[PDB]
């Protein structure tokens, strides 16, 4: 895969970010993850962690997978990096999201994320406690 530049417009919530990609505003849904809704347990915690990761970053990057790049709602589908650290992976790694929505063709980082979730469990970290 390959990374592309982008800039933050707005950190919406756990699983979505609005970015300027190719000079155009676009909302991205993070691939391979499901964050607890704002009103569920760990929701506000999961949300802050995500927001701050993209807001504190000096450089945001977009990385599409080998399949569809947009979902049915018109959201871009990608792995997002903050100063070279993958946001999708970091969220799962700290027990603030679960690997989910693994679709044929967009699963390049599936095993890396599942290892992060296994590691987060070994520690009953956040959502695993
Ligand atoms: C992450 C992801 C979500 N989706 C769709 C499936 C779900 O459809 P439904 O709206 O019918 O449930 C929806 C959930 O995204 P959210 O978890 O943001 O709500 O987004 C994809 O199609 N591909 C993806 O890679
Ligand atoms: Ca969600």
PDB file of C-alpha atoms and ligand atoms in Angstrom:
ATOM      1  CA  UNK A   1       0.000   0.000   0.000  1.00  0.00           C
ATOM      2  CA  UNK A   2       1.061   3.634  -0.032  1.00  0.00           C
ATOM      3  CA  UNK A   3       0.600   6.724   2.109  1.00  0.00           C
ATOM      4  CA  UNK A   4      -0.740  10.029   0.786  1.00  0.00           C
ATOM      5  CA  UNK A   5      -0.804  13.483   2.331  1.00  0.00           C
ATOM      6  CA  UNK A   6      -3.877  15.074   3.872  1.00  0.00           C
ATOM      7  CA  UNK A   7      -4.711  17.612   6.524  1.00  0.00           C
ATOM      8  CA  UNK A   8      -7.193  17.456   9.341  1.00  0.00           C
ATOM      9  CA  UNK A   9     -10.377  19.462   8.985  1.00  0.00           C
ATOM     10  CA  UNK A  10     -12.239  17.922  11.917  1.00  0.00           C
ATOM     11  CA  UNK A  11     -11.842  14.947  14.284  1.00  0.00           C
ATOM     12  CA  UNK A  12     -15.496  13.879  14.362  1.00  0.00           C
ATOM     13  CA  UNK A  13     -15.670  10.833  16.609  1.00  0.00           C
ATOM     14  CA  UNK A  14     -14.157   7.382  17.285  1.00  0.00           C
ATOM     15  CA  UNK A  15     -14.258   5.991  13.788  1.00  0.00           C
ATOM     16  CA  UNK A  16     -14.501   9.037  11.504  1.00  0.00           C
ATOM     17  CA  UNK A  17     -12.297  11.988  10.630  1.00  0.00           C
ATOM     18  CA  UNK A  18     -12.824  14.806   8.166  1.00  0.00           C
ATOM     19  CA  UNK A  19      -9.705  15.518   6.186  1.00  0.00           C
ATOM     20  CA  UNK A  20      -8.634  17.534   3.219  1.00  0.00           C
ATOM     21  CA  UNK A  21      -7.442  14.919   0.703  1.00  0.00           C
ATOM     22  CA  UNK A  22      -6.323  16.049  -2.720  1.00  0.00           C
ATOM     23  CA  UNK A  23      -7.449  19.572  -1.787  1.00  0.00           C
ATOM     24  CA  UNK A  24     -11.041  18.412  -1.218  1.00  0.00           C
ATOM     25  CA  UNK A  25     -12.832  17.920   2.096  1.00  0.00           C
ATOM     26  CA  UNK A  26     -13.694  14.261   2.651  1.00  0.00           C
ATOM     27  CA  UNK A  27     -14.955  12.210   5.557  1.00  0.00           C
ATOM     28  CA  UNK A  28     -13.043   8.990   6.198  1.00  0.00           C
ATOM     29  CA  UNK A  29     -14.297   5.972   8.038  1.00  0.00           C
ATOM     30  CA  UNK A  30     -11.353   4.111   9.548  1.00  0.00           C
ATOM     31  CA  UNK A  31     -10.890   0.607   8.106  1.00  0.00           C
ATOM     32  CA  UNK A  32     -11.044  -2.549  10.253  1.00  0.00           C
ATOM     33  CA  UNK A  33     -12.379  -0.967  13.473  1.00  0.00           C
ATOM     34  CA  UNK A  34     -15.538  -0.374  15.548  1.00  0.00           C
ATOM     35  CA  UNK A  35     -15.404   2.088  18.431  1.00  0.00           C
ATOM     36  CA  UNK A  36     -18.009   2.090  21.228  1.00  0.00           C
ATOM     37  CA  UNK A  37     -20.654   4.762  20.575  1.00  0.00           C
ATOM     38  CA  UNK A  38     -20.401   8.000  22.554  1.00  0.00           C
ATOM     39  CA  UNK A  39     -23.218   6.813  24.838  1.00  0.00           C
ATOM     40  CA  UNK A  40     -21.820   3.338  25.579  1.00  0.00           C
ATOM     41  CA  UNK A  41     -19.040   2.399  28.010  1.00  0.00           C
ATOM     42  CA  UNK A  42     -15.608   3.781  27.103  1.00  0.00           C
ATOM     43  CA  UNK A  43     -17.220   5.904  24.373  1.00  0.00           C
ATOM     44  CA  UNK A  44     -16.098   9.348  25.550  1.00  0.00           C
ATOM     45  CA  UNK A  45     -12.738   7.771  26.480  1.00  0.00           C
ATOM     46  CA  UNK A  46     -12.381   6.104  23.077  1.00  0.00           C
ATOM     47  CA  UNK A  47     -13.425   9.313  21.359  1.00  0.00           C
ATOM     48  CA  UNK A  48     -10.908  11.600  23.090  1.00  0.00           C
ATOM     49  CA  UNK A  49      -8.042   9.162  22.443  1.00  0.00           C
ATOM     50  CA  UNK A  50      -8.841   9.196  18.734  1.00  0.00           C
ATOM     51  CA  UNK A  51      -9.446  12.924  18.417  1.00  0.00           C
ATOM     52  CA  UNK A  52      -6.282  13.803  20.260  1.00  0.00           C
ATOM     53  CA  UNK A  53      -4.179  11.405  18.179  1.00  0.00           C
ATOM     54  CA  UNK A  54      -5.118  13.206  14.954  1.00  0.00           C
ATOM     55  CA  UNK A  55      -5.210  16.695  16.487  1.00  0.00           C
ATOM     56  CA  UNK A  56      -1.757  16.409  18.090  1.00  0.00           C
ATOM     57  CA  UNK A  57      -0.183  15.019  14.903  1.00  0.00           C
ATOM     58  CA  UNK A  58       2.104  17.190  12.805  1.00  0.00           C
ATOM     59  CA  UNK A  59       1.456  15.032   9.766  1.00  0.00           C
ATOM     60  CA  UNK A  60      -1.617  13.072   8.802  1.00  0.00           C
ATOM     61  CA  UNK A  61      -1.491  10.490   6.059  1.00  0.00           C
ATOM     62  CA  UNK A  62      -4.140   8.533   4.195  1.00  0.00           C
ATOM     63  CA  UNK A  63      -3.571   4.950   3.069  1.00  0.00           C
ATOM     64  CA  UNK A  64      -6.148   3.198   0.914  1.00  0.00           C
ATOM     65  CA  UNK A  65      -6.311  -0.591   0.762  1.00  0.00           C
ATOM     66  CA  UNK A  66      -6.633  -2.730  -2.375  1.00  0.00           C
ATOM     67  CA  UNK A  67     -10.456  -2.659  -2.509  1.00  0.00           C
ATOM     68  CA  UNK A  68     -13.246  -0.099  -2.500  1.00  0.00           C
ATOM     69  CA  UNK A  69     -12.128   3.344  -1.366  1.00  0.00           C
ATOM     70  CA  UNK A  70     -15.597   4.639  -0.469  1.00  0.00           C
ATOM     71  CA  UNK A  71     -18.480   3.067   1.410  1.00  0.00           C
ATOM     72  CA  UNK A  72     -22.175   3.280   0.577  1.00  0.00           C
ATOM     73  CA  UNK A  73     -22.431   6.534   2.502  1.00  0.00           C
ATOM     74  CA  UNK A  74     -19.695   8.191   0.456  1.00  0.00           C
ATOM     75  CA  UNK A  75     -17.108   7.984   3.244  1.00  0.00           C
ATOM     76  CA  UNK A  76     -13.525   7.290   2.232  1.00  0.00           C
ATOM     77  CA  UNK A  77     -12.213   3.985   3.589  1.00  0.00           C
ATOM     78  CA  UNK A  78      -8.576   4.012   4.607  1.00  0.00           C
ATOM     79  CA  UNK A  79      -5.953   3.473   7.275  1.00  0.00           C
ATOM     80  CA  UNK A  80      -5.002   6.812   8.784  1.00  0.00           C
ATOM     81  CA  UNK A  81      -1.538   7.605  10.126  1.00  0.00           C
ATOM     82  CA  UNK A  82      -0.634  10.313  12.661  1.00  0.00           C
ATOM     83  CA  UNK A  83       3.074  11.138  12.545  1.00  0.00           C
ATOM     84  CA  UNK A  84       3.665   7.664  11.103  1.00  0.00           C
ATOM     85  CA  UNK A  85       1.721   5.780  13.774  1.00  0.00           C
ATOM     86  CA  UNK A  86      -1.415   4.072  12.442  1.00  0.00           C
ATOM     87  CA  UNK A  87      -4.541   5.399  14.166  1.00  0.00           C
ATOM     88  CA  UNK A  88      -6.608   2.303  13.386  1.00  0.00           C
ATOM     89  CA  UNK A  89      -3.942   0.182  15.068  1.00  0.00           C
ATOM     90  CA  UNK A  90      -3.312   2.424  18.071  1.00  0.00           C
ATOM     91  CA  UNK A  91      -7.031   2.488  18.962  1.00  0.00           C
ATOM     92  CA  UNK A  92      -7.318  -1.300  19.045  1.00  0.00           C
ATOM     93  CA  UNK A  93      -3.951  -1.614  20.823  1.00  0.00           C
ATOM     94  CA  UNK A  94      -5.143   0.376  23.836  1.00  0.00           C
ATOM     95  CA  UNK A  95      -8.449  -1.479  24.168  1.00  0.00           C
ATOM     96  CA  UNK A  96     -10.509   1.421  22.815  1.00  0.00           C
ATOM     97  CA  UNK A  97     -11.868  -0.256  19.688  1.00  0.00           C
ATOM     98  CA  UNK A  98     -12.384  -3.761  18.354  1.00  0.00           C
ATOM     99  CA  UNK A  99     -11.293  -5.198  15.040  1.00  0.00           C
ATOM    100  CA  UNK A 100     -14.442  -5.328  12.872  1.00  0.00           C
ATOM    101  CA  UNK A 101     -15.899  -4.879   9.384  1.00  0.00           C
ATOM    102  CA  UNK A 102     -13.220  -7.001   7.783  1.00  0.00           C
ATOM    103  CA  UNK A 103     -14.236  -7.156   4.136  1.00  0.00           C
ATOM    104  CA  UNK A 104     -12.628  -9.154   1.358  1.00  0.00           C
ATOM    105  CA  UNK A 105     -10.156  -6.921  -0.450  1.00  0.00           C
ATOM    106  CA  UNK A 106      -9.649  -4.334   2.313  1.00  0.00           C
ATOM    107  CA  UNK A 107      -7.898  -6.540   4.907  1.00  0.00           C
ATOM    108  CA  UNK A 108      -4.196  -5.843   4.433  1.00  0.00           C
ATOM    109  CA  UNK A 109      -3.658  -4.874   8.072  1.00  0.00           C
ATOM    110  CA  UNK A 110      -6.105  -7.393   9.500  1.00  0.00           C
ATOM    111  CA  UNK A 111      -3.527  -9.610  11.196  1.00  0.00           C
ATOM    112  CA  UNK A 112      -1.565  -6.646  12.525  1.00  0.00           C
ATOM    113  CA  UNK A 113      -4.740  -5.281  14.087  1.00  0.00           C
ATOM    114  CA  UNK A 114      -5.816  -8.640  15.452  1.00  0.00           C
ATOM    115  CA  UNK A 115      -2.400  -8.980  17.152  1.00  0.00           C
ATOM    116  CA  UNK A 116      -2.958  -5.529  18.680  1.00  0.00           C
ATOM    117  CA  UNK A 117      -6.353  -6.587  20.033  1.00  0.00           C
ATOM    118  CA  UNK A 118      -4.905  -9.841  21.382  1.00  0.00           C
ATOM    119  CA  UNK A 119      -2.191  -7.797  23.106  1.00  0.00           C
ATOM    120  CA  UNK A 120      -4.792  -5.359  24.516  1.00  0.00           C
ATOM    121  CA  UNK A 121      -6.767  -8.314  25.860  1.00  0.00           C
ATOM    122  CA  UNK A 122      -3.768 -10.012  27.485  1.00  0.00           C
ATOM    123  CA  UNK A 123      -4.004  -6.892  29.641  1.00  0.00           C
ATOM    124  CA  UNK A 124      -7.779  -6.589  30.052  1.00  0.00           C
ATOM    125  CA  UNK A 125      -7.010  -3.034  28.922  1.00  0.00           C
ATOM    126  CA  UNK A 126      -9.896  -0.568  28.910  1.00  0.00           C
ATOM    127  CA  UNK A 127     -12.725  -2.324  27.069  1.00  0.00           C
ATOM    128  CA  UNK A 128     -11.244  -5.690  28.007  1.00  0.00           C
ATOM    129  CA  UNK A 129     -11.783  -4.999  31.708  1.00  0.00           C
TER     130      UNK A 129
HETATM  131  C1  LIG B   1     -15.712   0.192   8.269  1.00  0.00           C
HETATM  132  C2  LIG B   1     -16.713  -0.072   7.170  1.00  0.00           C
HETATM  133  C3  LIG B   1     -18.025   0.224   7.350  1.00  0.00           C
HETATM  134  N1  LIG B   1     -18.924  -0.015   6.328  1.00  0.00           N
HETATM  135  C4  LIG B   1     -20.355   0.245   6.491  1.00  0.00           C
HETATM  136  C5  LIG B   1     -21.028  -1.027   7.056  1.00  0.00           C
HETATM  137  C6  LIG B   1     -22.130  -0.518   8.017  1.00  0.00           C
HETATM  138  O1  LIG B   1     -23.347  -0.431   7.271  1.00  0.00           O
HETATM  139  P1  LIG B   1     -24.654  -0.078   8.149  1.00  0.00           P
HETATM  140  O2  LIG B   1     -24.793   1.523   8.304  1.00  0.00           O
HETATM  141  O3  LIG B   1     -25.878  -0.568   7.233  1.00  0.00           O
HETATM  142  O4  LIG B   1     -24.631  -0.717   9.479  1.00  0.00           O
HETATM  143  C7  LIG B   1     -21.600   0.889   8.391  1.00  0.00           C
HETATM  144  C8  LIG B   1     -21.114   1.024   9.833  1.00  0.00           C
HETATM  145  O5  LIG B   1     -20.156   2.095   9.861  1.00  0.00           O
HETATM  146  P2  LIG B   1     -20.187   2.773  11.325  1.00  0.00           P
HETATM  147  O6  LIG B   1     -19.557   1.750  12.378  1.00  0.00           O
HETATM  148  O7  LIG B   1     -19.426   4.045  11.280  1.00  0.00           O
HETATM  149  O8  LIG B   1     -21.697   3.154  11.733  1.00  0.00           O
HETATM  150  O9  LIG B   1     -20.566   1.275   7.458  1.00  0.00           O
HETATM  151  C9  LIG B   1     -18.506  -0.533   5.155  1.00  0.00           C
HETATM  152  O10 LIG B   1     -19.306  -0.728   4.261  1.00  0.00           O
HETATM  153  N2  LIG B   1     -17.206  -0.811   4.947  1.00  0.00           N
HETATM  154  C10 LIG B   1     -16.290  -0.607   5.920  1.00  0.00           C
HETATM  155  O11 LIG B   1     -15.119  -0.888   5.705  1.00  0.00           O
HETATM  156 CA1  LIG B   2     -18.870   2.814  14.715  1.00  0.00          CA
END
